[PDB]
């Protein structure tokens, strides 16, 4: 009974049912132009290309 | 009569129609994890936090 009514209904996000959707670690992605080059890395042909 | 004809109708993508979407330079990003950590850069409190 516990775990049914805490596991149903209105309820924080849970993000395992979301893909690991975390509301309080929304995650996103900022331009930065790179100030100072980057050291090398390795990838494949077309990766590279 | 020919700029009508040749910007009407089935013809290549206009990246000036469509935000700068060019076909031969799809955009896209790779996850790369970083070996050797970069040199600072600055900005504002919330985007360091």
């Known amino acids: 009974e ?3 009514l805490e596991h ?3 309820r924080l996000i849970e993000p395992e049912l979301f ?3 975390d509301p309080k670690k929304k995650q996103m992605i900022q ?3 790179v100030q100072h080059d980057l ?3 390795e990838c494949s042909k077309e ?3």
């Open 19 to 21: 893909n690991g959707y």
């Open 31 to 33: 331009e930065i132009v």
């Open 2 to 4: 516990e775990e049914i």
């Open 8 to 10: 149903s209904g209105i």
């Open 39 to 41: 050291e090398p890395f």
């Open 47 to 49: 990766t590279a290309e």
